[PDB]
């Protein structure tokens, strides 16, 4: 996250931290995700495509720091890794960039909710907020594009939704933005998602509910003029989600 | 890796 502010898991308790194990034993951060039910985490397919073996992943919930444990955190193995069948990647962007992870502990249990571990509500089909609405993004992604390292402390910021019309202009992304994507940005372009925020939540309060509106997917640079962040439009994928979550 | 990837391994 470029700009914004440091936060803790209590402010975003559905945030899932996803890591990949290596052979000689080292564990490294992969992507963000969002807890949508005790046994299920939603993220982005591009996080996993290159290594799509479930045994390779660990999920943490209740975790505020990247490479240090947070008191109360829970570790999970990935029982099932579900990648979207129509996923693709261009020279530029990803399509159908959505994934589901069924989590279970070594004890055979799903997530136990707490002050640091909560689920987030899904949206209503084909219902997204108005353009110009302010929403939250969260993650452990870079604080500046030039950084080599990732913050050890979780961060969050605010960006405003951009009209499909506006984001589709060549000044911006032209035809690369489809209707299954949502754009959002800072009006000064001063704050944004960046590398390592992928798979994480875009959260808006539509009506009275905090709701998972988008999943961090792509963009050109970070906090770059006329180049907004692009998010998997979750309200267009509800049949896919409910289908693969009924087990 | 697409040019506009944000993925931590691109
Ligand atoms: N929102 C931006 N700028 N992004 C999204 C995550 C990939 C890097 C670019």
Do the domains A13-119+236-247 and A1-12+120-235 match in fold?
Answer: yes
Per-domain residue ranges for chain A? Answer: 1-12+120-235, 13-119+236-247
Give CA torsion, residues A200, A230, A46, A8, to 10 deg.
Answer: -10
Contact yes or no for A150/A29 (Cβ under 8 A): yes
Q: Of A198, A184, A191, A223, nearest to A141 (Cα)?
A: A198
**A198 at B interface, C-beta within 8 A:** yes
Specify the resolution in Å.
Answer: 1.8
The rounded distance, in Å, linking the Cα atoms of A151 and A222 is 16
Topology, domain A1-12+120-235: Thrombin, subunit H (2.40.10)
Query: Cβ-count burial of A183 within 10 angstroms (0-12 exposed, 13-18 middle, 19+ buried)?
Result: buried
Distance CA(A33)–CA(A212), nearest Å, equals 11
Distance A104 CA to ligand 1 centre (A): 30
- Assigned token pair, A45: 């397919």
Active-site positions of A read 46, 97, 198
Q: How far is CA A72 from the centre of its chain?
A: 22
Find out whether A44 and A128 touch, Cβ atoms under 8 Å.
no
Pick from A91, A194, A198: CB nearest B3: A91
Gap between the Cα atoms of A186 and A171, Å rounded:
16
Question: From CA A222, how far away is CA B6, in angstroms rounded?
Answer: 9
Q: A23: Cβ–Cβ under 8 A, 6 or more apart, which residues?
A: none
What is the CATH code of the structural domain delimited by A13-119+236-247? 2.40.10.10
Q: Which residue lies with its CA nearest to atom 3 of ligand 1?
A: A222
DSSP A9: G
Q: Which helix (DSSP H) or strand (DSSP E) does residue A30 occupy?
A: strand A27-37
- Token pair, residue B4, equals 């506009």
Distances (CA, A) of A191 to A5, A148, A185, A188: 10, 18, 7, 8
Exposure class string for A84-118: b at 16+ Cβ within 10 A, else e? beebebeebbbbbbbbbbbbbeeeeebbeeeebbb
């Amino acid at each position: 996250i470029i700009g914004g502010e440091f936060t803790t898991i209590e402010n975003q308790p559905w945030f899932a931290a996803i890591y990949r194990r290596h052979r000689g034993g080292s564990v490294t951060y992969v992507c963000g995700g969002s807890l949508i039910s005790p046994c299920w985490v939603i993220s982005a397919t591009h996080c996993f495509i290159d290594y799509p073996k479930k045994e390779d992943y660990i999920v943490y919930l209740g975790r505020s720091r990247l490479n240090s444990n947070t008191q109360g955190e829970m570790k999970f193995e990935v029982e099932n890794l579900i990648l979207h069948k129509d996923y693709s990647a261009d020279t530029l962007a990803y399509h159908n960039d959505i994934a589901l992870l069924k989590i279970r502990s070594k004890e055979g249990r799903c997530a136990q909710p707490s002050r640091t571990i909560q689920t987030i509500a899904l949206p209503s089909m084909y219902n997204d907020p108005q353009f110009g609405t302010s929403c939250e993004i969260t993650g452990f992604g870079k604080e500046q594009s030039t950084d080599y390292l990732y913050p050890e402390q979780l961060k969050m910021t605010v960006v405003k939704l951009i009209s499909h019309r506006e984001c589709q202009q060549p000044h911006y992304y032209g035809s690369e933005v489809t209707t299954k994507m949502l754009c959002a940005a800072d009006p000064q372009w001063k704050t944004d998602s960046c590398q390592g925020d992928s798979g994480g939540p875009l959260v808006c309060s539509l009506q009275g509910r905090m709701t998972l509106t988008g999943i961090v997917s792509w963009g050109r640079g970070c906090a770059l003029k006329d180049k907004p962040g692009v998010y998997t439009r979750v309200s267009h994928f509800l049949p896919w989600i409910r289908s693969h979550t009924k087990e | 890796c697409p040019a506009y990837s944000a993925y931590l391994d691109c």
